[PDB]
Amino acid sequence: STQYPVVDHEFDAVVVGAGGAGLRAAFGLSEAGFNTACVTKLFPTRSHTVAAQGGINAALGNMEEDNWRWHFYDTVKGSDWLGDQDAIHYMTEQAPASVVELENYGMPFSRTEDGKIYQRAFGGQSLKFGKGGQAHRCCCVADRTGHSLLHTLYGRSLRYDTSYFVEYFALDLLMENGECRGVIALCIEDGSIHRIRARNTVVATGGYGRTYFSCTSAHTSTGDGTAMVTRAGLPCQDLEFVQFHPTGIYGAGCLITEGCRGEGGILINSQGERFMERYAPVAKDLASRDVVSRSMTLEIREGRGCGPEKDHVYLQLHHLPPEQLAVRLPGISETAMIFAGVDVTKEPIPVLPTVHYNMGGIPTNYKGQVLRHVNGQDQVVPGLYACGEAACASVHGANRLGANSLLDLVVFGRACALSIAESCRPGDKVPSIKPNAGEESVMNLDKLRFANGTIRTSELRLSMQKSMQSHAAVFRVGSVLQEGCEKILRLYGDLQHLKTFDRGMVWNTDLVETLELQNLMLCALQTIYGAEARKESRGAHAREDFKERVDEYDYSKPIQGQQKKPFQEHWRKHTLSYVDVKTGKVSLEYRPVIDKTLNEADCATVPPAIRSY
Amino acid sequence: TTAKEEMERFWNKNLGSNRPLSPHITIYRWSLPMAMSICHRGTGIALSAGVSLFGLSALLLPGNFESHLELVKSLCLGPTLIYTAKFGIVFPLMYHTWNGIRHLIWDLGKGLTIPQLTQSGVVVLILTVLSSVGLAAM
Amino acid sequence: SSKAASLHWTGERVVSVLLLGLLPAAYLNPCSAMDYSLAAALTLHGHWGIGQVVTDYVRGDALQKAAKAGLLALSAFTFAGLCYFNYHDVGICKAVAMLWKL
Amino acid sequence: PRIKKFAIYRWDPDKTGDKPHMQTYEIDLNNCGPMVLDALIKIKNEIDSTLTFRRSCREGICGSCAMNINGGNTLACTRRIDTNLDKVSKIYPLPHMYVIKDLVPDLSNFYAQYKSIEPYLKKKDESQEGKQQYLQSIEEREKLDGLYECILCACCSTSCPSYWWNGDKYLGPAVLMQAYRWMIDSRDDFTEERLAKLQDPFSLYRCHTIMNCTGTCPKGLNPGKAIAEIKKMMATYKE
Ligand SMILES: *Cc1cc2c(cc1C)nc1c(=O)[nH]c(=O)nc-1n2C[C@H](O)[C@H](O)[C@H](O)COP(=O)(O)OP(=O)(O)OC[C@H]1O[C@@H](n2cnc3c(N)ncnc32)[C@H](O)[C@@H]1O
Ligand code: HEM
């Protein structure tokens, strides 16, 4: 310690992460007149949202007549009723205004003949509450909507006085008596340490797909934000619900937008059957991500692969007009060729269900405020917000509806900024800080910095990824799960026998990738444990032991003469997980899901029904 | 912080440091276009030097152009040398001339594609040789 | 505001096409007129040309300012020397001609 | 067994008196990915984790890879390794840029330059923004194809000799093309002032149409073709 001089910055608000969520939170806070700081370990534009291709949902009604309420219905249903309906209400009602805001910022959306934002079909989205047919509200910029969303937001941010700490690694939250005072970070450029303190902190650090071996996410999706919340002793919610995306190249795991399917493409097994029509007649190839992959993943078992080891499947686009794949899916044509070596206009792309999205994250309010659980009740953590994939306002519940994440990003990014602007004023008293705040973080830094152990950071990470890949994939059971828990708790033990080689102060990717490992571990522990304990099948979480949807009632048959099971007797509740940073001991609890919306009169609650597409 | 302050910060940080400049011309792969770009300058430079030498000489040196020519005629001028020197003068002028036409076409915004680029380069190169040998015998 | 940079850019192209039409013109019709305009365009075009090479390679207020100055000189003595030659001598055209049948 | 040789530039800021030098590494191509980044990651995790370089998407759309591979600026994650065991791959940092450490360059000036062209929509009346989607015919929209896909990797600019000599005042291809992106967006109302910003001898005019930028874009875009469009606009706009 004190071998690392510390620099103290003071702001009104701090945002950790410059992806869609973070960026929107940051410039939205400045636009409101707050002296905002934005910490990111990557150049804002390198953020993962750039890889997003599909689009952003919004009932604009450009293609046909629409109603945001139908978007609401579709989303709560797609969540398998683990989604908090109040947040889903807020998100879908704000979507139109949020998307028009993006277009007014300059986002180069693809146009219709009327000169309006072009929208398209996507996974399980209907009209008139699941009755009116396939909906078309997936707004998009050709096939590079994420890239364009991030760039326009970034560009728009240049217009304000936000101080952007570029390539800074956030180590931990500056907590004091259950209140957030800011963050402490490592400036990757010179290895120095900075304590950026503020009245409000917003965590938008993205997901943690890298906890696995095969995922569509970037090497940077290491759950660093989740880990901070965990290190503070705060709960994380529903970390078990991990979304497996159907189409992911057998190779590096790169993604091929689901927009391919929405645009016309299909999925084909070895025998040539359009199986996604057998497992789900109506929705077919275009159903929930959790079901559609659960399908394929299965077909591989029966023994119906489409390549050498019959380990994957085959995505088809061939029958679509070569021009349409040029105006609607130009981005996939490129990587399909570069990583697969295929001409989509005349050949199907090789895809396989791989980890993709994380519905779980930091427990949130529909206003972005982080929640902790006290005496079985929600409590707002003063001066702490979270948004994006790292957050769990849980508008996605047990399963994210395609094209709803970019929306989530923009909506709650805005909500955080608004809740801060509505609850305080720039210039207000910025909380004190003990002269030793962050000492633990720096020490842990100094430790790994000179780690002379026996295991290489890469070796350990590889052990954790393949373990998660084998024990917590698309299908699970107590046996496979428990071996995984102890298997992963075993690796957590090894974090003390790790060896690092680089020891300089400048760009120690050796040191940071290790710090990231510590983070990925905290996420895996909570994912696998929360997964073993959840004895039911909802959304992405499918147990072989319990292929049942254990709710408070049995919503298949009627409800009235029937009796309500005690809260601790059913599984229609969010998983809350904690962990002793020092031992890796996972303890967990639960809290109800919110079923009431913001206004019964404007958007009615949708009771649990049977899950099917 | 503004765009300008950011630039000021950039230079103040790097100039005052032990940071090295990554190699460039020593490692970058040469291409016909890049090479033909260099020659355009070189020739334009050599060509201007010549014209200046002709004009300055016309102001400082004594005698008329003829006093200078006859001066060379009686210098054992070998035919397979009068042609050489005549070519060396026509070469850079023609090259610069044709490439210049190419440059003008580009300003109109035409032919700016890698494929179109190589074609024109080859053409310009061929026209150079032709017009040079051609003129060296006029 | 003033569009100086853009106008200079166009100026260059213009004398560039002019000097392009002169070479042929000077062949088909050699005359004292041609020898002067040919000297004007030849020196101007070259002045603006070296100009670009200078602003490109010479770093520093000190140097560029001087460089530009010395360049202007050379150009002046070049245009004058050419006009002198066209007046008190053969003329560039006939000089080229003579120099060729040699 | 198929060993591939890798010559890689190196330089440690925290190693007194260290001087830029090449370090060669060997890799069994059967135990590796097809792309250059795979190799980098591999020698990073097994041979020497002191090797530093930027990366993230490994999919070719974030722009984190930008570096010179065998004399050419591209994306390590998209450039497939030369299976010719006889040749030894040469990996250098982007050209004529300050090296922070190993293959990691200081792109601060580059980003700053991007900020100076104000890469965002500007309407004369912003009092109604956020309430209705602006209209743009698919015709006006097509004019952006080939311009908005820029990943800001800096391969182009960092391959331009003019940017090499005057990167401090010359905006470079990358920025120039985005300025063009904004110039021709039917929804922007500041075309005239965006062009006026380039009225000096360096920002735009250091471009001598060398064309390396276009000859090296990992995304097949055409900066040069765009620089020329700006030039034409610059000499024909009024006021
Ligand atoms: C992986 C993926 C996801 C995806 C997609 C395509 C791919 C390949 N396409 C989508 C689509 O078409 N439609 C849609 O609705 N969603 C799609 N997704 C999912 C979605 O894009 C993601 O969930 C979303 O982009 C996540 O956004 P978010 O803003 O939350 O996060 P991020 O962009 O991943 O950025 C993380 C930021 O946080 C900073 N960071 C991270 N850790 C640190 C630390 N330790 N210190 C400081 N900063 C940190 C990053 O630097 C970054 O800015
Ligand atoms: C046949 C007639 C000619 C044409 C069509 C022509 C055309 C051009 C063009 C288009 C350029 C600009 C290139 C760029 O964009 O960088 C140029 C530059 C130049 N030219 Fe010429 N030119 C001609 C004759 C000459 C002659 C006879 C001389 C010698 C006195 C000359 C000397 C130069 C110089 C010094 C440059 C500057 C090149 C640079 O920017 O480095 N040109 N010319």
Ligand SMILES: COC1=C(OC)C(=O)C(CC=C(C)C)=C(C)C1=O
């Ligand atoms: C005309 O544009 C060019 C230059 O000027 C900017 C160069 O210096 C160079 C460099 C030559 C030496 C190797 C430094 C090249 C190649 C070039 O095309």
Ligand code: SF4
């Ligand atoms: S144009 Fe091409 S090289 Fe130049 S940054 Fe944009 S992507 Fe890269």
Ligand code: F3S
């Ligand atoms: S290399 Fe440069 S010089 Fe012009 S064309 Fe591309 S910007």
Ligand code: FES
């Ligand atoms: S790492 Fe993202 S482009 Fe190569």
